[PDB]
């Protein structure tokens, strides 16, 4: 064809073909491009915005506005060629080969006189054709962009404008920063209704009105590394690609099952099984947690809030201080919660707060700041939640942190986000934060009976009451009663049998033997670790002597009679 | 730009439209709306920022919410609120997150959390949450802002703050200001907790900060603990969280006057009133609906009412 | 090894262009003792800057010609090597590595080379980094098999900071501590060098000049070491005598010391 067609595509001729997506909205942004393009000296609008806001789609909406006739008469019938700089450098082996193939482009624009060049990725203009010798494409274009011999719409991101164009301060002045902002959800549902015809044509499925409202709403709060126009388009496009692999309609709920399989955040209307399990959530968490009934039905109600669609979209899903005596199930409930929501307690994000003993290990929560080592790894808590935003985040022994480790979590527990050292606010909104604080016999002085208010007010003296107001529920745990230690014996014997006696050996305990373990393992002030030390002192060390001696060995059922 | 007459009546009713998100807090909303009215009228000093506020007082009574309410009035969202906090900046070298690394140290081309967001929109409400929980070297760097409205980055370039609304939310005023009664004998409320107590919040800022940081900050507003009259109006605002998009889909949550009264009675602290009301509506309303939506006693196509059948 | 990045110190010692080395005869034996090893034969000369570490090797390069070799150092040419000169001119990839693999190719083909590299603090990080290809990754396989004889020179701090902090570099260079010489040893250095300084400046340096240069340099100068701060005094005094023109004494080296240090008279 011609020179311009070799290196770019005529985006107006492709708009006459209808191969461009229709652009709803953006009328302030397109009229701002055309009023920059109509200027005398610099008529070069760079379209800067976050990656995803549709700053390419503005010119895609401009190339339509030319060929629809919505364009002013000073930009009437002007062919808007995009420019692949990679097509210009390709095959430019020889010395003047890139410069001539760039000046042939520019001679063609001045010859025709109806060309609006569109250099997408304007940060790649500097260094285009850079080598050991020859002049890059930016320093070629510098006299033409300032004097007005060339109309060039730029479209770079905000990061790439700062990293590569603002570091070339002569090139920055020769463009006009047109702030292509991230559209609102009310603007995105007009994008999506305008794009409904292009996805009903491609996927051969009709996307309902509620699914456009859902995909723009659900993408705003459940995604924060991507921008509204695209990430809401990503939910309509992929749910349209659900239904074309099952062939009718793309439901409101068809969007939420795409988002739920993408972030990992369950946002869909519940399966009949999952509805019954979540009303069984107390009695399923009691399969591991013996006792601690108000501890379970405080942390089970937080998951019922998230799954009933009553999660506060600013606040995290749950924020708990599991205070109480050492060994009664603070960490075990955080593991029983993580097994309930995920299937294993290895999905529990456990930040062991005893490691943070001074003020400067807070750089492990959010990583190093710029200019320091460990900046590239960007945090050992923030990056655990960018991958899994639906997470139970355990802060084990938060009392043993410094007094301003947890002051770094004062925006985590109301605003629901923590700014990374690299500069990324990460959504702690879909997390369940748990702060297990650890709070011997009787206290000072005369008192009847013998407690929870001693634990509550010690949190007021240790923790800063900015941090306590952000906690949803402070749960002081119970002493494990003797009727709960008997049930705890059955749980810990169920550890050594079946998981550690897969030797064709079966472990059976008589009811007098479980009563003897409960009478030896029961001390109110510790709870369930003296029981666990009893079982490895009465049962499974005498049993390990019987396996090595092969008194009772592999292929034989062990019964445990009572010793005395 | 010269004011559209619709926008002028918004600035004249700026207090009343910030009181649609802030309940109570009379002189707090007022002294912030005065900073926007002296800016759009063209009466701003062109050597200082548009507003340099300290929101001192009890934690979570509207300090960060007025900063979000101000960002709603000026932009329509809280995503234009440049909330670079200060309670994660406890070390001196975390000031390189505000400014970026100097060139030749990693993260210098992308560095700057504060200054690169302010350079995009110089008219930006900048919130500094928990300003006292930063290292003292950040203040000496942020003293450059309050004198000139210009600030040198790590890269060695300037950035305009003469149009920002700087808000230095300080949680100072929680030692015995977080305690409702003070020390010793005195009369009832407003004589033991605002005429015994607001001097101590001003004293805790004069000792923690250098004076030239406070002299250039043009408003220091100790905030009010919320009265029971300022809680009954908040329950109407907190139900609107629940009865909105969380319950808008084919359900309608209306609460009786008996039910709004119990939340104001159970969610009242005489030091607080935003967060314990947020918790008691979460515990007594929002946990009860979460069980009833999943068990489908309250489903789509119903109007669930809440009352108190105990009195 | 080419004469581009260093020079042949044994060919210089055969022509007698190197400094006569009086003293350090015990240190040269310790270098020969490390160089006579089958593996790890790499003596690093640990000494303060300007204590005569090259003068150990200049005397060692003479001992190749004088025949004081252990018969495993016989007819071994000793090319000195500026490690930083291979670094200079490297902004693109494979600039340092090509010029380092060339000079190691010219050792396997020639077969009698003893490199003297100075600045072994430059060895760690001669390229981009340690995970990148540096000279502290190319030399190391041949420094453990004895197929490459490199004589080193650090300070003591450069040896602590760059070699003792480097795993697998302590074991490949064997420390030879070139000490700081005493005042009488320094005079005997100056007694051997005077046939060069009296023939270069065309002056006569008296015996009283050197007993003063070994005393006044320790007495007044503390930022720099003796077997250099004493050589310098009878060097510049011969140049000042050539400039003012002839006999150097403890009055001619006197005003040379007064030029630097803040002494009005």
């Amino acid at each position: 064809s011609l020179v311009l067609d070799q290196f770019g595509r005529n985006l107006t001729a492709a708009a006459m073909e209808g191969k461009l997506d229709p652009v709803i909205g953006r009328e302030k942004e397109i009229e701002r491009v055309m009023q920059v393009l109509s200027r005398r000296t610099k008529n070069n609008p760079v379209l800067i915005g976050e990656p995803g806001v549709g700053k390419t789609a503005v010119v895609e909406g401009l190339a339509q506005a030319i060929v629809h006739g919505e364009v002013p008469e000073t930009l009437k019938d002007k062919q808007l060629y995009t420019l692949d700089l990679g097509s210009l450098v390709a095959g430019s082996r020889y010395r003047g080969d890139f410069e001539e193939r760039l000046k042939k482009v520019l001679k063609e624009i001045n010859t025709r006189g109806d060309i609006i060049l569109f250099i997408d990725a304007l940060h790649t203009l500097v260094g285009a054709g850079a080598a050991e010798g020859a002049i890059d494409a930016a320093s070629i274009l510098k006299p033409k962009l300032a004097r007005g011999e060339l109309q060039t719409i730029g479209a770079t991101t905000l990061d790439e404008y700062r990293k590569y164009i603002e570091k070339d301060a002569a090139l920055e002045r020769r463009f006009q920063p047109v702030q292509v902002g991230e559209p609102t959800v009310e603007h995105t549902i007009e994008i999506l209704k305008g794009l409904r015809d292009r996805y009903e044509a491609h996927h051969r499925v009709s996307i309902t009105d509620a699914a456009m409202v859902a995909a723009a709403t659900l993408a705003d709060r459940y995604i924060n590394d991507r921008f509204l126009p695209d990430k809401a388009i990503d939910l309509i496009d992929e749910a349209g690609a659900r239904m074309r692999i099952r062939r009718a309609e793309v439901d409101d709920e068809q969007i939420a099952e795409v988002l739920g399989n993408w972030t990992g955040i369950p946002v869909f209307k519940l399966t009949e099984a999952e509805t019954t399990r979540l009303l069984r959530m107390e009695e399923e968490l009691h399969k591991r947690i013996i006792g601690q009934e108000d501890a379970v039905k405080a942390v089970s109600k937080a998951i019922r809030r998230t799954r009933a669609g009553l999660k506060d979209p600013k606040r995290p899903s749950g924020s708990f201080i599991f205070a109480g005596p050492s060994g009664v199930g603070k960490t075990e409930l955080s593991k029983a919660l993580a097994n309930f929501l995920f299937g294993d307690d290895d999905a529990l994000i456990q930040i062991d707060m005893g490691e943070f003993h001074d003020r400067f290990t807070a750089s492990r929560l959010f990583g190093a700041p710029p200019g320091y080592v460990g900046y590239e790894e960007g945090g050992q808590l923030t990056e655990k939640v960018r991958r899994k935003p639906f997470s139970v985040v355990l802060f084990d022994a938060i009392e043993k942190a410094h007094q301003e480790i947890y002051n770094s979590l004062l925006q985590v527990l109301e605003d629901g986000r923590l700014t990374d050292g690299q500069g990324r606010t990460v959504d702690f909104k879909n997390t369940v934060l748990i702060f297990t604080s650890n709070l011997k016999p009787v206290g000072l002085g005369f008192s009847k009976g013998g407690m929870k208010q001693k634990v509550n007010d010690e949190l007021k003296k240790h923790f800063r009451p900015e941090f306590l107001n952000r906690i949803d529920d402070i749960i002081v745990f119970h002493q494990l009663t003797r009727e709960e230690i008997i049930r705890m014996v059955d749980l810990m014997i169920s550890r050594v049998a079946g998981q550690l006696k897969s030797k064709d050996m079966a472990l059976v305990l008589t009811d007098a033997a479980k009563a003897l373990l409960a009478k030896r393992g029961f001390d109110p002030v510790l709870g369930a670790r003296p029981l666990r030390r009893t079982i490895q002192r009465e049962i499974e060390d005498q049993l390990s002597e019987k396996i090595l001696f092969e008194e009772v060995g592999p292929g034989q059922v062990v019964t445990v009679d009572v010793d005395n | 730009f010269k004011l559209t007459e619709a926008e002028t009546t918004r600035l004249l009713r700026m207090e009343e439209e910030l009181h649609k998100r802030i309940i109570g807090q009379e002189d707090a909303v007022k002294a912030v709306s005065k900073a926007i009215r002296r800016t759009r009228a063209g009466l701003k000093d062109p050597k200082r920022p548009s507003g340099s506020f300290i929101f001192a007082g009890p934690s979570g009574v509207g300090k960060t919410e007025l900063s979000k309410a101000l960002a709603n009035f000026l932009f329509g969202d809280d995503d234009a609120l440049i909330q670079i906090d200060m309670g994660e900046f406890h070390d001196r070298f975390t000031a390189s997150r505000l400014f970026g690394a100097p060139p030749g140290y990693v993260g210098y081309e992308e560095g700057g959390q504060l200054t690169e967001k302010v350079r995009r929109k110089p008219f930006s409400v900048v919130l500094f949450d928990a300003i006292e929980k930063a290292h003292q070297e950040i203040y000496n760097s942020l003293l450059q802002v309050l004198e000139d409205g210009r600030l040198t980055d790590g890269q060695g370039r300037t950035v305009d703050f003469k149009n920002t609304v700087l808000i230095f939310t300080s949680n100072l005023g929680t030692s015995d200001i977080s305690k409702p009664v003070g020390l010793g004998f005195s009369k009832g409320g407003g004589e033991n907790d605002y005429e015994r107590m607001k001097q101590k919040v001003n004293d805790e800022l004069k000792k923690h900060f250098r004076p030239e940081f406070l002299n250039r900050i043009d408003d220091i507003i100790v905030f009010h603990q919320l009265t029971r009259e300022e809680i009954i109006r908040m329950v109407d605002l907190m139900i609107s969280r629940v009865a909105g998009q969380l319950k808008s889909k084919d359900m309608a949550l209306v609460l009786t006057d008996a039910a709004k009264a119990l939340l104001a009675k159970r969610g009242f602290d005489p030091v607080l009133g935003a967060r314990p009301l947020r918790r008691t509506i979460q515990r007594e309303i929002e946990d009860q609906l979460s069980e009833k939506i999943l068990f489908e006693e309250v489903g789509p196509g119903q109007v669930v009412t809440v009352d108190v059948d105990n009195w | 090894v080419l004469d581009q990045f260093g020079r042949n110190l044994t060919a210089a010692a055969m022509e007698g262009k190197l400094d006569p080395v009086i003293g350090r005869e015990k240190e040269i034996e310790r270098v020969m003792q490390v160089l006579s090893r089958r593996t790890k034969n790499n003596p690093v000369l640990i000494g303060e800057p300007g204590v005569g570490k090259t003068a150990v090797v200049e005397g060692l390069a003479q001992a190749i010609v004088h025949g004081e070799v252990p018969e495993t150092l016989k007819d071994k040419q000793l090319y000195t090597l500026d490690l930083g000169s291979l670094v200079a001119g490297s902004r693109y990839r494979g600039d340092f590595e090509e010029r380092l693999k060339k000079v190691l190719k010219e050792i396997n083909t020639r077969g009698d080379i003893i490199l003297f590299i100075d600045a072994l603090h430059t060895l760690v990080g001669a390229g981009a980094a340690e995970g990148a290809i540096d000279a502290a990754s190319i030399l190391k396989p041949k420094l453990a098999r004895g197929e490459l004889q490199t004589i080193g020179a650090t300070t003591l701090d450069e040896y602590r900071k760059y070699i003792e902090k480097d795993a697998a570099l302590e074991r490949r260079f064997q420390p030879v501590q070139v000490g700081e010489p005493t005042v009488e040893h320094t005079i005997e250095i100056l007694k051997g060098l005077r046939d060069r300084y009296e023939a270069h400046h065309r002056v006569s340096i008296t015996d009283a000049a050197m007993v003063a240069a070994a005393t006044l340099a320790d007495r007044y100068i503390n930022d720099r070491f003796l077997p250099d701060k004493a050589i310098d005094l009878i060097d510049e005094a011969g140049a000042r005598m050539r400039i003012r023109r002839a006999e150097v004494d403890d009055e001619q080296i006197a005003e040379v010391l007064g030029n630097w240090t803040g002494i009005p008279v």
């Binding site: 010395r95 080969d97 001074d358 | - | -």
Partner: peptide, 24 residues
């Protein structure tokens, strides 16, 4: 005593490969 060392990592000074201009 509790004076922290401030690692202060430099940006990577690294080599560059080359596109070359072809000649006869």
């Amino acid at each position: 005593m509790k004076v922290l060392i401030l690692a202060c990592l430099v940006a990577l000074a690294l080599a560059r490969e080359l596109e070359e201009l072809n000649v006869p």
